Design a protein around this ligand. Structure first.
Ligand SMILES: C[C@@H]1O[C@@H]1P(=O)(O)O
Ligand SMILES: C[C@@H]1O[C@@H]1P(=O)(O)O
Ligand SMILES: [K+]
Ligand SMILES: [K+]
Ligand SMILES: [Mn+2]
Ligand SMILES: [Mn+2]
Lengths: 138, 137
């Protein structure tokens, strides 16, 4: 039986710039670093950066919708997003679904998101306004 | 400040086979499905499948090391991995780091992992034998 996400590993092209992004701009806790990677945490999330020569800096129009969303409070959301924009962090999508979201890119083009709201909130909102063809399971 | 992972979203090329993979082979809870996606949960993890025409079925030698690992108990690991093998789910590497891991591919080539062990456990093991050039904070 699976009990949750154990860790998220991101391939990065340059270790020090990527560590600075996740530690300083996103406020994650840096636990350890070595010449091929780094270990960070964000609440319960175990984040791994892996230095990978196969990684290319990918513009958002050349990658699919796969993306990673981090939780933030309603009160912190707007100034956090504004600080990222002032830091030159690129936006890859305008928010369109329920709950505050800021869609931004990491230094290698990994697609990230800040989101306010849980799965329960999304399901309740979708029951009120169902997506095309949407069905629910008890 | 950020408080954790809110959700993981995977682009998929065929919605029904991917739902069957995550719901039936991995045992995740299917909450909702629509013409272009699905919502599942795995413990506290909110997983979204997004039907994407752009999604390529990507061989593991043409993608980088980005991958997603799910937690499983030590008692459950061996038989869960064996069921994936019997279902023909591909393995993309052998375990070379501390703590039981099974490295497998989803139908579109997303790199997945079953793993027993926490961050605290990995940090404990690294303090006994650090990786190359390792610095501790
Ligand atoms: C919540 C799932 O990722 C989708 P959204 O970000 O389009 O809402
Ligand atoms: C835990 C970080 O992904 C690396 P590993 O799976 O190679 O140990
Ligand atoms: K949203
Ligand atoms: K391992
Ligand atoms: Mn999202
Ligand atoms: Mn891993």
């Amino acid at each position: 039986m699976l009990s949750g996400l154990n860790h998220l590993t991101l391939a990065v092209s340059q270790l020090a710039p990527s560590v600075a992004f996740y530690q300083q701009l996103l406020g994650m806790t840096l636990h350890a670093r070595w010449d091929s990677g780094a270990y960070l945490s964000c609440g319960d999330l175990w984040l791994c950066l892996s230095l990978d020569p196969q990684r290319r800096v990918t513009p958002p129009e050349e990658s699919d919708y796969t993306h990673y969303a981090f939780s933030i409070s309603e009160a912190d959301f707007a100034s956090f997003a504004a600080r990222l924009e002032a830091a030159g962090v690129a936006v890859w999508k305008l928010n369109r679904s329920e709950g505050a979201s800021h869609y931004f890119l990491d230094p290698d083009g990994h697609k990230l998101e800040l989101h306010v709201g849980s799965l329960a909130q999304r399901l309740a909102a979708c029951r009120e306004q169902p997506y095309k063809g949407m069905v629910f399971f008890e």
